[model samples]
Target chain A: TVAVIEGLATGTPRRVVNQSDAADRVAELGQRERIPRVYQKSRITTRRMAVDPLDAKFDVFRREPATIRDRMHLFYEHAVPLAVDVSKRALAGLPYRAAEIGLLVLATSTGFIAPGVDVAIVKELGLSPSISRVVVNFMGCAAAMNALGTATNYVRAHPAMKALVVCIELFSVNAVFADDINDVVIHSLFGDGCAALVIGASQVQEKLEPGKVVVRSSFSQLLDNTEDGIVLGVNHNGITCELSENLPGYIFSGVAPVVTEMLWDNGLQISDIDLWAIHPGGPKIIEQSVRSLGISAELAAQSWDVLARFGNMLSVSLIFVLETMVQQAESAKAISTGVAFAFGPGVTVEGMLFDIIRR
Target chain B: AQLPPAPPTTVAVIEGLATGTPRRVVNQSDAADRVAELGQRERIPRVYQKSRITTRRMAVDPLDAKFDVFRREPATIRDRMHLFYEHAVPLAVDVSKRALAGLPYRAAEIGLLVLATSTGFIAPGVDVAIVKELGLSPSISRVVVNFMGCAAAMNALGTATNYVRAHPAMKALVVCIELFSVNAVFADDINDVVIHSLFGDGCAALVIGASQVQEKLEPGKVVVRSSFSQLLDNTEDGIVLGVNHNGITCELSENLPGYIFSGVAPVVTEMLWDNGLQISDIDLWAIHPGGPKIIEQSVRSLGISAELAAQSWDVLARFGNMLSVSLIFVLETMVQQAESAKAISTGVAFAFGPGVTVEGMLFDIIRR
Candidate 1:
């Protein structure tokens, strides 16, 4: 039995900061000259934040920055409701009841809390108290794929069960104001968002339903010599992300083979794919992936569209892209098969093959 | 067209196990004296004395003022995390190597790496470090189970179990590393004293695989039959672990044992019952010693003999509570006991953590 996507949903905070406005906020931190250049190069026109960047009470980037405790307090305050919201939406209109969710796989990198974000989600969603839970914490942007893979296996192992995969990344709370270009680039690329997917195996007699998406398989590869390519460390100020300049190049060099192997194993080729849901780590990553795979820009339109609209939501980005693809496919009835990809710390390349059965 | 015959059921087994601790061992007497000398509230020393822990290994010397971040000025979360990275990565790598050394499989054979740590948070954390240092396959699937507190290893094991059961030929490495000593709370509150006295630093690693039923069984190897987990209602605050300006602050409630006792029996019963066994049919037990009370309460609630949980007491006395890694130590002790006695037995392992969660696994000790 294969795990099928029953539903998908996403939630973003109300505060949407456009590029010019984000530049002004960066200018407030005394990086006026570099802000505009980096923001433009970020290829991010707008992004959502859980907290206002200039809010004196909650902002961590101020001169007297909020402590790690302060940042975590914000995480607990905002991440829970956002996760609950997305999860509720994901479960909406599904045939199964919330109590039928036998597994909860949560992925996040921007927050760490005990009695973790999973417990609160269980309570809010009215999920079974005995539900098996797995938190893919601090694995970075590729973590959602890890969560998806785990959920897929769970559903395969227990065909009667369903799994809910929730990803909540509140990066705004971890924002750091620094002179380093790496910090500037990270700030320009990340935003706050949450996404959830409900996955379960189809019954043996049920044929593949129209407009339904089933996960075919997943592939993961940790790029060699790139353990330090992307690192997230907690400092006195807050959680800080360090991105190496060569990260995109390293990913570009390693991703093609990984995706190719995934396709070949599934008896398909790059040319056979009809849609792409690439994690928009940045413009260069998307561009490099397109060039490396020898795919046209039109194939990766949703990735660019997500990046321009929401920035990179860390672990939540890939799901947002997947949701967009599924929506477009449902509306136009054009896409039938594709693959989704994400990169994170460890410079890990994670991909999943999928088939969208059209009516 | 008709489907081919289904493959034989795969049995997930523990193939190898190893544990590691830091060099600095702090005896109970020494810890008590240090607490007194530091002008802490008088209850601190008393708690240590009653903890029944003889000694514990720490990443840093509690007596050495220069090395004691607990006594230093800048002992913030960042500072402690830096200490965690310095000590945890090497310890994890060392234990993982030891665990893999005796396995029939090579490092590249490990298709999944599940790392559990509740004491620290870092991206590309000990999991990534272990992969790089051990030269595991770059394609290895990874999962980092963080902030789940003491029950995390059981959770990691469950995940690996499912993965291996789904992909029978692949192997998974489960590594639990915690630097609780680095995140020690030094306040005068009794909760602080309890947290500081109970937790030490250690790492434990295990290699797990699903073998075909026709495969030959190794002497004293354990086969995982089933697992269970439950979150007790209205008990979310029973044992709280959160990050604070000082470090990881643990508010362990005195009522935690009661909450756990109320929920443990059913969870364990369900696990064992699912495996077609009863408590009386088991010959071994490896219960997480969150503290003396937790173990005692677990034994009492389950109506089991203290001898059944002897390994739990032994680990608690020697290493205190290494958090998630403690249960692995218990399992290792059980394996050693069985091998020495040449005994075949069935047993259950139980661990409790935040959310008043109970995680239990049922297994058998088979000797060919």
Candidate 2:
């Protein structure tokens, strides 16, 4: 059985924060002179947030202190509803019914809840009570890749079942307000977002429909000595994220070999691929990936576009890029092959090769 | 052109297993007296004595001020997480090393790592820490199963089984580590006392892989045949794990065992029937002892002999309920008993978690 991507959809919370408005909010923190420079460097013009920057009830970035419990409450309120929304949208026009999804792969680092977002999504979508669930937690940005790999494996093992992969990160709920460079960069680079994909295996003697994307293979690598490159922990103040200055360098050095091996195993080369959906971990990470893979700048255009529009939605960012690539491919009616990859804690690089079958 | 047929399904096996516990062990009577000294004398001893846990390991000495973090008024989530990082990581690393010690594959050859835990949450969590400490492949695929409660081990094992079945040549390691002792509740409520009396600190690791039917089997290898899971209706609140002012707290209802009783039998029967076996064919049982009542109720509901669940009772008496890690202890005990007796038989494992979820796995024990 071959796992194929059948449908895709994405969702963001109602509030949108423009660059100037975000800078203005930072001014209230008395870092007006320096913080806006970081936001400008992020190259993000606007991004969606789960709550208004100054919303009284849910904003963790406000001057008043918020407990971890308070932030978790906000997570419980917003994460599930967004997940359900995207999942419904993903399944809207597909042949599969919500009850037919036999596996649920949920990835998130911004929240922790028992009877997690998995149970909530199942209930809201009216999925089968017996749908197997895999909650991928706290793996950071590369989590979506892990989730996709899991769903792919499930569909491959049980070819009769379809899998739903949902990536929801409410980064806004865990946004840090400190003035440290790492904190400022993290605060400016992430926004709240969710994405869902319906993946299924092709029948043994059947071919995928035109415009369908078939997942060919996956690759993962944890860069040596980069365990501390990106760290996320919970404290009295809520989720804490620390990014190392060496992360981009680590990706640049390690990603090429992993990508090469995956392609080589699949009887293809980097030049044979036409589409690229590099996760917009940040401006530098994308640039590093392009430079290391020797892919043309235009190939990473969708990645840059996603970064500009959505900032980094953590794990949700990569799927948004894939959704864009799929739309572009469908519009052109082209048979394109592509690779989507992301970097996360452990300074891990995760990538997958796929082919768009447009007959 | 048609795609090729699905690759032949391979048989995944439990190649190795190992477990670890923290250093300090608190006697039941001493633990009860200490809680009473903290001014919860009314129901503390009664709950502790009835728990049937003679002693259990803890990362912190109960008589020390560090352990008072749970009993005192001011320890924050940050403090609890600090303790979690300090203890959970090393214990996981230790147990993983033991599991991999005599395995046929090297650390670098393990293709996947599934780390399950519910007591604490962190990124670059125990999963990454184990990779770094054990020097497992930097390229190994990783999955961290968090906040799933006791059934998490079976869930993790199910994931590993699928992955290995999908890639027959690769091996996967499943690790279940919990530091529940750090999240102990000290409130005077009955629920808090019940929660406090039942948990300990531990970790367990299993190395899993797939082989052809004709391949030579190790002396104590267990072949995984099938797995099943089900979410019971309207039981979401029966067992809940959440964060609070003090730290991670569990709101376990008395109805939890009842929920499991109503749901477990069908799950087990389905798992067995699908594998073309009967309940009488199961020679060994690894039932997660969520508590004494859970074990008793599961046996009663399944109409199985109590002897089938002797390992479950033995583990509960020895380590209390280590949450997700408890099920692995039961399996390890079963494996040891079978090895000592030179017996090759079929076995079934079951666990329940937060969704009032019931997970079952069927396996065949073989001695070459």
Candidate 3:
């Protein structure tokens, strides 16, 4: 029987454009379009969004009569190279051969390419030629949890098998040139980046570094017919992110119950979690989640810190927060229980419970 | 009252469309005629002449020789997506019903629904609509295995195996629905032309649960013995799906067949080794009919005779390529033939995807 062991997690936020500079670009583009002025106040303060190196021209969204297909093209070209870089780092600490990964599951929201980025990942990383692949795409921000759950399931089923989960979001590619305030918000809130981790059973327990994180449980809740709450649709322009004003209210009331359910399933409560890695969709979203869950400001600070630094990298943002948690948990060596949360299009909220298992 | 312990692994080959596809047929010659009518006849590559794909079928409204999408330009992503939501979701629902019709469990008994598609994209994805139409449990978990291309079938099946292995009490339904016709590229690009010519729309659904369940371990059922997958590095360009003005586009390197063939032997051998079997032990094969050459390559690599590959060839001739759904159609044929003809007990199923990846599984015909 195989048991899934957790390995190192790594991320690559397009290191080119600083989050603060990218936010100004968004603000200028907004003011030029005369987007109803709340653009700056509601947007980046300390948050500095990373820019895709491809956007050094910054002409991506400004082209005359662009199609969604154009954005998708960039989506592929950008996501693959970034994925290869981060996947190499994520798998570096693991002892398994690239070809030994039984399942390679990738989750993305901003773009899709086929064989999808997972194919490039396999090729660039020298993964097994027979590696089974699953791309949980267009699922929006919560997809990282979906990828994690999938890898966990595969490794749990086959105790000896290793599964890799990669979450990449080049939200920068989906930037649409529109006058709508929602468009401005989407442009300001997102940045391009990726995060990945290799999961396997404890079979390689000795081979892995001591105190690797162990995924304990995962939960997903899609609010009924809330499709309109947070929609990521394929438009003629590009993939559009539509956020309903009701979203914050939904998260405010919604996250606590789900987090409670997750923690309670593991025979614990909110107070029991030592580390909290919440998706930093925006400052308000994080505030609402932290407030609703009654989590400590200190525990939720890493999420805010990531938002201030990288904006919302969509699926990759949560993993960034996860890395922060890992670092903090390592230094403090006191906190063992951690919970991560992210929201997506279905008004879907995913909760992941994990433990820091030191050898 | 206590119940019996569940079997660690059980793969019950449930039901499939027994009457082949549910749509009207289009012969390859007719398709070619339509292409010529669109003033693209000269673009037809010679390799396709030997494709051995006689005909295929589609569930969507057929475009005439002067189809608007191709005649003007390729369909826009929004239009194609609209078509997918309208056509593919219903087709998926129907196939799912057919698969689950006589099963002892109610719709609520299904705990997981994993939809695999490479031809289309939508979210809260098609799986959300599937749950709504099938009346499955609201709490049922859903996974959209998108854009893995044809090899997605085996990949998805492996996922279902994982679910069953992890939670024996839960029933997982795996659906592979491809609407390749919807993503048709109306271009002279050889890769586009061949892909447009080869793919036919199709859908498949299967129910998997723990073998410990009473009705699942019955005679004639196919139990999954093991599943394996491996990626061939540096062959990324060998097969590709990209976005174009006409929605998603495909590029197939001439070296793709060779790449697939080169990397397949090791994966298939490894899977067989896991099951304590060899090539000779596999009496049945359900290889994806990606193209005539791909099937030939698989046959050559396996050292199997052309006659042994008839099922795949026949499906190719009748339905062309259905992308992710093709191999399951082949497996359905295997199950039906095995049941009626008292064929051999062991079988191997394989398919290739854009990773230049080869995924295979070993199955045993169980006798309870």
Number of the candidate with higher lDDT, 2 or 3: 2
Model 3 C-alpha lDDT per residue in residues B1-368, reported as the tens digit of each score: 11212224544343223223547688788677666665435666453566688888876534655446443563367667667767777788888888877577787677777888877777666787778788786557777887778888887887777887777777789998888676665665666677878888888888887664445455546777777666676777777876655666667889987886787776787778777888777788888899888998888887877888888998898899888888888877766665334433788888877757777777866544
Candidate 1 Cα outliers beyond 4 Å, as residue runs: A59-62, A203-206, A330-335, B1-8, B39-41, B69-71, B212-216, B339-343
Ranking by TM-score: 1, 2, 3
Q: Which residue runs of candidate 3 sit more than 4 Å off their true CA positions?
A: A1-5, A13-24, A27-39, A42-62, A66-73, A94-100, A203-211, A294-299, A329-335, A357-359, B1-24, B39-51, B62-71, B212-216, B260-270, B339-344
Residue range A1-359, candidate 2, lDDT tens digits: 67889988999998888977787777577436887788778888889988664666534354445366667778879988889989999999697765568899999988877787889988888998888888888888888899999998888777767899999999877665776778878888888899999988786457667757888888888888887788887765668678888888888888788898888888889998888889997899899999999888888899999999989999999999988877767345457888989987878888889888776
lDDT of each: 0.83, 0.83, 0.72
lDDT of 2 at B174: 96
Model no. 1, DockQ:
0.55
Which stretch of 10 consecutive residues in model 2 chain A shows the poorest summed lDDT?
A57-66
